[PDB]
Structure 1
Amino acid sequence: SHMRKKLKAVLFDMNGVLFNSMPYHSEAWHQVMKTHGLDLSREEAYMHEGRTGASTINIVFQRELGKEATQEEIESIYHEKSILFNSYPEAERMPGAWELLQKVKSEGLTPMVVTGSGQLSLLERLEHNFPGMFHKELMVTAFDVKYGKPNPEPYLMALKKGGLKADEAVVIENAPLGVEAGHKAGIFTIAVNTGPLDGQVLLDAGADLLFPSMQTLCDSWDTIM
C-alpha cells in the first residue's frame, strides 16, 4: 500500500505475456534442433524461455554433445528458428494484455517491454497490437544485452532507461528465468502462469505474486498492494 504510490512503470515480458507466441517458439526450437541433429523437447524449450537465442543454443549444445556451439552454428540455428517461427499463422495478443495496458496507462504508469526475444516480426507488431503503449527508448530486447535472463541485466537496463529506481517499477513475467531476472534486479515481480508449467516454479524463482492468466491479473489489478 506504501509501495503502490511509489509505482511509476510496469515492465512487461513480450512472449507469453503480451503475445501468445510461446507454443510457436517451443515448437520452433524443437524442430530446428531436431534438424540440426539435437534433442530439445518442447517442454525444455519452455524452460529456456527468457534466454538469448545464443545462450539457449550454447546450453543445449553442452548438455547434448559436451561441447560449445560455434558462432556459425549459433547464427544458422537462430536464423532458422526465426524462419520457422515466422511460418506459423501470426501470433495473437494474450487475452487480457491489452485491457491491462489500458488500466496501467490510465493510472499514469509507463509501460515498458523487457524481452529476451530478438524476433523482429513480433517487435514490429507491438505498435499495431498495443497502440500508443510502448516506445523503443523504453524497451529492452535481445539486441541490448550481453548476457540476458536470468541475469538481472536486462531489467537493470530497463530501470536505467526509464530513469527508475527498483521500487518505482513492477515486473510482469511468465517464465522462471525471467521471474528470476526481475527478482534479482530487486523489482517487485508478478508471475502470470500462461504456459504449461507448475506455478510453483515461478514462486520458487522469486515471484511476489502469482496469477494463472493475464485476464485474472487484469481483474485483480486494482486490488494489488
Structure 2
Amino acid sequence: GSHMRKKLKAVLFDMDGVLFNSMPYHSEAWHQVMKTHGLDLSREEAYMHDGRTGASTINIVFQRELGKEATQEEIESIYHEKSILFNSYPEAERMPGAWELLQKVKSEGLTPMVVTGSGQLSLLERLEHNFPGMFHKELMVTAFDVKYGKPNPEPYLMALKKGGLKADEAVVIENAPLGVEAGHKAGIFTIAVNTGPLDGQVLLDAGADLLFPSMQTLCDSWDTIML
C-alpha cells in the first residue's frame, strides 16, 4: 500500500542494458572472443549471460561447450581479449530514460546504487561522467566485490549491507534474467526492464515483480507504480 512506497530508501541499478546501451557490444565481443578461442557462443546466448562476472561467463561457456572447467590462465587471457574487443567500439552511450529516472530517484530522496557483474573499468569510470552526482564507489557492488556474482543473491546481499539497508527498503532495476533472479533471491522487489531482444516472459519467470519495455517507460510510470 502506502507502506511499500514509504519504506523505500535506495534504488539498485544494473549497469549494462540499464544505465548504458552496452549489450549489443557485450554480445558481439563475447561471441567474437569465444570464436577466436575455438568456442561457439551465439550473440543471443551471450545476451542471456548478462549479469554474470566475466570469470563466471567464461567458465560456464567452457562447461557447456567443452564439458570441462576453464583454467585461471584461460579466464584471464579470454577476459583481457574480451575487454580489448569491447573497448574497440565507439564508446557505449546512455540508455534513453536512465538519466531522467535517476533525477526522479534523487529528487525523491532515494539513494542510487550500482550492482553489476562488470569489471570493465572504461564503463565503471564513466558512471560519474554520464550520471553526475548520482553514484559513489562505497555504494556500488562490482565484479571486484564478489566470489560468485549473479544469479547468486550475493552481490545484492552485499549491496544491502553496503547501504545499511534491509531488503524491504530497496528496489532492483534489471534487464537480464540472471540479474532479476539474483535480486529476487535476495528478497528485494525487482523491476524488470526489457531493453534487449528477449521474451518479457523470461524476466517474469525469473521473479520480476513488474515488467516494463524500456527505461523511458519505467521513468514515465515511476510516480504511478507501487501504489
Q: Same-fold call, TM > 0.5? A: yes
In 1, Cα distance between the equivalents of 2:150 and 2:223? 29
The secondary structure found in structure 2 opposite 1:143 is helix
Report the Cα offset of residue 32 of structure 1: 0.2
Report the Cα offset of residue 68 of structure 1: 1.0
List per-residue Cα deviations over 1:114-148 (Å, max 9, x = no partner): 00111000000000000000000000000000000
In 1, Cα distance between the equivalents of 2:208 and 2:68? 33
- Aligned residues: percent identity? 99
Alignment RMSD: 0.4
Report the Cα offset of residue 35 of structure 1: 0.2
The residue that corresponds to 2:92 in the other structure is 91
In 2, Cα distance between the equivalents of 1:69 and 1:153? 22
In 2, Cα distance between the equivalents of 1:174 and 1:63? 23
Q: Is 1:124 equivalent to 2:156 in the alignment?
A: no
In 1, Cα distance between the equivalents of 2:109 and 2:225? 16
Report the Cα offset of residue 3 of structure 1: 0.6
Normalised TM-score (structure 1): 0.99
The residue that corresponds to 1:221 in the other structure is 222
In 1, Cα distance between the equivalents of 2:3 and 2:69? 48
In 2, Cα distance between the equivalents of 1:63 and 1:166? 34
**Mind listing any 5+ residue stretches in structure 1 that lack a counterpart?**
none
Runs of 4+ displaced beyond 3 Å: none
Normalised TM-score (structure 2): 0.99
Report the Cα offset of residue 94 of structure 1: 0.2
Report the Cα offset of residue 66 of structure 1: 1.1
Report the Cα offset of residue 37 of structure 1: 0.4
The secondary structure found in structure 1 opposite 2:56 is helix
Report the Cα offset of residue 2 of structure 1: 1.5
Aligned length: 225
Report the Cα offset of residue 154 of structure 1: 0.2
List per-residue Cα deviations over 1:174-208 (Å, max 9, x = no partner): 00000000000000000000001000000000000
The residue that corresponds to 2:169 in the other structure is 168
In 2, Cα distance between the equivalents of 1:51 and 1:43? 15
Q: Is 1:147 equivalent to 2:148 in the alignment?
A: yes
List per-residue Cα deviations over 1:95-117 (Å, max 9, x = no partner): 00000000000000000000011
In 2, Cα distance between the equivalents of 1:193 and 1:113? 18
The secondary structure found in structure 2 opposite 1:190 is strand
With 98-107 and 1-10 compared, the bigger mean Cα shift is at: 1-10
The secondary structure found in structure 1 opposite 2:78 is helix
Q: What aligned pairs does 1:1-150 form with structure 2 within 5 A after superposition?
A: 1-150=2-151
In 1, Cα distance between the equivalents of 2:63 and 2:133? 42
In 2, Cα distance between the equivalents of 1:175 and 1:94? 15
